[PDB]
Design a binder for this molecule. Sequence first.
Ligand SMILES: O=c1ccn([C@H]2C[C@H](O)[C@@H](COP(=O)(O)NP(=O)(O)OP(=O)(O)O)O2)c(=O)[nH]1
Ligand SMILES: [Cl-]
Ligand SMILES: [Cl-]
Ligand SMILES: [Cl-]
Ligand SMILES: [Cl-]
Ligand SMILES: [Mg+2]
Ligand SMILES: [Mg+2]
Ligand code: NA
Ligand code: NA
Length: 326
Amino acid sequence: TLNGGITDMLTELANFEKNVSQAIHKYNAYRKAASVIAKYPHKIKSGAEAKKLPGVGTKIAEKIDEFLATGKLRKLEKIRQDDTSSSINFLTRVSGIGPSAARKFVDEGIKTLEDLRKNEDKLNHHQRIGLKYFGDFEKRIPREEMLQMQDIVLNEVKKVDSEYIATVCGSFRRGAESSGDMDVLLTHPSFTSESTKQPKLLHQVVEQLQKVHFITDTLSKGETKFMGVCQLPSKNDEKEYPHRRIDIRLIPKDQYYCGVLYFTGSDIFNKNMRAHALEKGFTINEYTIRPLGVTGVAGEPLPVDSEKDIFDYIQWKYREPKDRSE
DNA sequence: CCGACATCGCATCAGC
DNA sequence: GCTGATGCGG
DNA sequence: GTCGG
Ligand SMILES: O=c1ccn([C@H]2C[C@H](O)[C@@H](COP(=O)(O)NP(=O)(O)OP(=O)(O)O)O2)c(=O)[nH]1
Ligand SMILES: [Cl-]
Ligand SMILES: [Cl-]
Ligand SMILES: [Cl-]
Ligand SMILES: [Cl-]
Ligand SMILES: [Mg+2]
Ligand SMILES: [Mg+2]
Ligand code: NA
Ligand code: NA
């Protein structure tokens, strides 16, 4: 919160580029700067001072000076005053509705929560559920609840097959006092980069979690990635808990470390690290880290037996999960 | 100046 | 049906 | 919007 004002401004700017301008790179550019500034250990006194940080160029430093003097940015003041942008921005908040869909709905007069509700027929499945739990999905999950959800998920998975290994990653694994959702990495000896000796591994788990009424809805479901909704059980007379988003990712057991690295994030930390890998001559994904050939083509998977092994290849000192929240 | 900017799963679509 | 491109999520 | 070469 040292430079909250500045990072909020950048984040707001980032969302506009993404949702309205549909300018993915400007969006990322703003996120990087917000990120680098968010960790900057000093209260920024000027754009020049900020422009010294990597990711902060001439344009952003100029905006920081405007914001510092006035306490606001005229460019954003206007954007907030543009109905179309206001609408597009709002619609993107529904899970399932992105920049394109948001703009399309707006072109059809559908531009408010009320418009959406009376037009469910014009929504795909995912968007439907996103609208259904709109409020709940805007709420944060106290870690305390994350702990309760962890017990349930791990114990239900164990019941299906003691050989499954479920790890809660994402912001939770990074130690956050609250998360936007629960992210679960799943593995089973039967599924390796070598073979799939047992199908429905993810399905089985999803089924058990539904049976106990933990998973309530589904956004999308494949053989390795499940995206849905879940809810903690409440007691008698107790008010119900909010519905929560849950992502489950089944990964080859022998590719655990690359998988846990990826799913632990943050997303920006991941972008920065994968970028660094490229510069060092490697390419990293949730499955492996591979060298980059002279032709550019990625080679064979390098041996990995710990997250640290990945950091070493790219010449980075290990960073605890708690220090990866960029 | 100018190209690169991380990576990929699932849903939906168009074209054949 | 298939593939490949796009959207949206990650 | 920013950066390296
Ligand atoms: O763009 C993305 C999004 C996510 N990820 C990875 C990192 C992130 O930590 C993880 C889980 O995705 P979430 O969207 O759940 N983010 P996270 O759990 O970090 O934060 P939050 O508390 O918002 O859920 O997936 C990427 O690599 N790229
Ligand atoms: Cl762009
Ligand atoms: Cl402002
Ligand atoms: Cl691995
Ligand atoms: Cl791979
Ligand atoms: Mg998460
Ligand atoms: Mg998630
Ligand atoms: Na800079
Ligand atoms: Na959305």
